[PDB]
Amino acid sequence: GAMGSMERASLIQKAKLAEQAERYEDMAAFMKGAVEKGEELSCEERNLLSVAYKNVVGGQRAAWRVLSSIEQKSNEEGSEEKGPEVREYREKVETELQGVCDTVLGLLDSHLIKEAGDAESRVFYLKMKGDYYRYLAEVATGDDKKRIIDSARSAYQEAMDISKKEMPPTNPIRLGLALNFSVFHYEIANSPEEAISLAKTTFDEAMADLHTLSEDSYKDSTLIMQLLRDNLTLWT
Amino acid sequence: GAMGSMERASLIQKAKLAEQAERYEDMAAFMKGAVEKGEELSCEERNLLSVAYKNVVGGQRAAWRVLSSIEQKSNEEGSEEKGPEVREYREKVETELQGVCDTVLGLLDSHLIKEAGDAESRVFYLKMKGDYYRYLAEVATGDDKKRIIDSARSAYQEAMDISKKEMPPTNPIRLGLALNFSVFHYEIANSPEEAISLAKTTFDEAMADLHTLSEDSYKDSTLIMQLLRDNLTLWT
Amino acid sequence: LRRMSDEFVD
Amino acid sequence: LRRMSDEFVD
Ligand SMILES: [Ca+2]
Ligand SMILES: [Ca+2]
Ligand SMILES: [Ca+2]
Ligand SMILES: [Ca+2]
Ligand SMILES: [Ca+2]
Ligand SMILES: [Ca+2]
Ligand SMILES: [Ca+2]
Ligand SMILES: [Ca+2]
Ligand SMILES: [Ca+2]
Ligand SMILES: [Ca+2]
Ligand SMILES: [Cl-]
Ligand SMILES: [Cl-]
């Protein structure tokens, strides 16, 4: 695309600059360019890709929630008719959000996942696939809502299976996967008991493996364990 | 442009929605569309226009400052050569910033200023003209730096002359103009004494007129007076 | 507060 | 801190 003429290394360099400047749209475009060079991504590069798109879609999701709330209140009894503008603008943001999700899922399918053989990379990309299908599910209302949900479920489940086989219970990728899958269960799949069970089991199994870790790894793992605990506190 | 097919009132409605969703690029595009309908703007509409572009350019300016600082450190003695990427990306952000400034200045010249006859509107637009020339001055380094600075000065000065003749010393537009002109003097024109003198005189003349104001107007005016005081404290 | 999803980086 | 420019709305 537009990044076709720029060196891979220069794209990565500029992605890091964009991060420092909080220019996440730019960061995402640079990382998309890097992916499209066709080489596998390093651990650091995978994280740059994730950070960029998480921030972009994060802003869109927050905007969508604001507009959806306004729209929902417009369709209450006693609410004055204000015309099509709220729906139109919500639809505009929604379409742009769906576009970003489709872009990420496209990168994963062409060809990040198929080339990813190590557990760390494969679990990372499958978690991402689950996440971006989950974001599509957040705004889905039509025929394909069930299929979008199933796509998220399937990606998360494959990731969980690999992570349980190949990674320690304290691995931050494994922990973040379980966290997000538990949110999927609670928010998307209408399965709060599964969400709670997964969060509890994940936390407890990590707790039991902390003794194996260095100070720095301990800090990393306990950070994410706290997020699991925060959700458990909210949900129980 | 792209907003040519949308009703004026719908553009304004959506600008307000975009503000609530913190979608300032969208807000700015909607307000540009509204301006290009060719009708004068109300006080509320003028404020929507200002808020939108202030937020857009604000993000660009913050990014530019980050990248410029990195670039400046790259050109120190003992710094390792990292290639053209820092300069290139700083230039990219700078060009986009200049583009936004040119867009705003274009709207003011075609034809907001010439149609603005009331003091409140005319001072508002001339202040805006000064502000966006000031933002151009922040990144200017070439032949035209002096002319850009003079353009900012001239707009601010015309605004000040009208505001002193036609507005009370506590008018928030007059106060915000004087605040920004004082920043121009301090930061752009290398005239810290003029900056301090203007901020002091403005504050003192507002103080003496507060007794004329309602509770609500008092709150508005004292808010901006505090910004003048904050700068005086930093500068002295 | 809103529930947490993953924000680990790395 | 950084100096203030106008943030009045309105
Ligand atoms: Ca190429
Ligand atoms: Ca190459
Ligand atoms: Ca839709
Ligand atoms: Ca491989
Ligand atoms: Ca292993
Ligand atoms: Ca038209
Ligand atoms: Ca019309
Ligand atoms: Ca330049
Ligand atoms: Ca007029
Ligand atoms: Ca008057
Ligand atoms: Cl729209
Ligand atoms: Cl660039």
Numbering used by the authors:
A (entry chain A), B (entry chain A): -4 to 231
C (entry chain B), D (entry chain B): 114 to 123
What did the paper state?
The model was used to screen 296 potential binding sites and to select eight peptide sequences for follow-up assays. This includes an ‘open’ binding mode, where peptides bend out of the 14-3-3 pocket, an ‘extended’ binding mode, in which peptides occupy the entire 14-3-3 pocket, and peptides featuring a disordered C-terminus. The identification of such structurally representative 14-3-3 binding motifs, without having provided such structural information to our models, testifies to the strength of our deep learning approach.
Among the numerous protein families facilitating PPIs, the family of 14-3-3 proteins stands out due to their ubiquity and high conservation across isoforms. These ‘central hub’ proteins hold a key role in cellular signaling networks, as they are known to interact with over 1200 protein clients, and are involved in pathways related to metabolism, apoptosis, cell signaling and tumor development. Protein interaction with 14-3-3 can yield a multitude of effects,8e.g., the structural stabilization of the client protein, the masking of functional sequences, or bringing two proteins together. In this work, we developed and validated a deep learning approach for predicting putative protein–protein interaction sites between 14-3-3 proteins and phosphorylated client proteins.
